[PDB]
Curated annotation (Swiss-Prot):
Residues carrying the site annotation Cleavage: F10, Y11
Shown segment, full-protein numbering: 591 to 751 of 1143
Domain RNase H type-1 span(s) in chain numbering: 5-162
UniProt binding sites for Mg(2+) 2: D13, E60, D83, D154
The name this protein goes by in its record: Ribonuclease H
Length: 165
């Protein structure tokens, strides 16, 4: 109804693991889940992107950029949901809002991670059809359709950590 009809939905997740050896290093991975609005809710496919020299914060923002390009790539509009509101609202408003200030957040401090936002700006610049949403945590209500994607994305993110050590 109000949601409308989109080609599908993209759920991204980010996780990181700390070890005693890599004191100044952590293992993080990204998990993306694709869903559809057909008459039967089902994941079209799963995506895992293990990071080597990245951090949990970078895995969360990188997860939104990943589906971001894959979302617009589709010949139709897609919805992208993330477990971080900052990153989500980032490509949702900061992306276009920062461009107005020349990729700058406030005059007091410059925009951070501009390179990461620059890549997402190239996709969102092609068309706002890319919708961004922020997960409400894990199992926020007795029943939730978005929560299901969070479970599949959580497993993909954990598998990314096993890909690197």
């Amino acid at each position: 109804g109000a949601m409308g009809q989109y080609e599908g939905v993209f759920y991204t997740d980010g996780s990181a693991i700390k070890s005693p050896d890599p004191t100044k290093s952590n293992n993080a991975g990204m998990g993306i889940v694709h869903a559809t609005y057909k008459p039967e809710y089902q994941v079209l496919n799963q995506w895992s992107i293990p990071l080597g020299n990245h951090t949990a914060q970078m895995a969360e923002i990188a997860a939104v950029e990943f589906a971001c390009k894959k979302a617009l790539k589709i010949p139709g509009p897609v919805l992208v949901i993330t477990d971080s509101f900052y990153v989500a609202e980032s490509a949702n408003k900061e992306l276009p809002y920062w461009k107005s200030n020349g990729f700058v957040n406030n005059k007091k401090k410059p925009l951070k991670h501009i390179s990461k936002w620059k890549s997402i700006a190239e996709c969102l610049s092609m068309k706002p059809d890319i919708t961004i949403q922020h997960e409400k945590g894990h199992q926020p209500t007795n029943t939730s359709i978005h929560t299901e994607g969070n479970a599949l994305a959580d497993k993909l993110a954990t598998q990314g950590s096993y890909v690197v050590n």
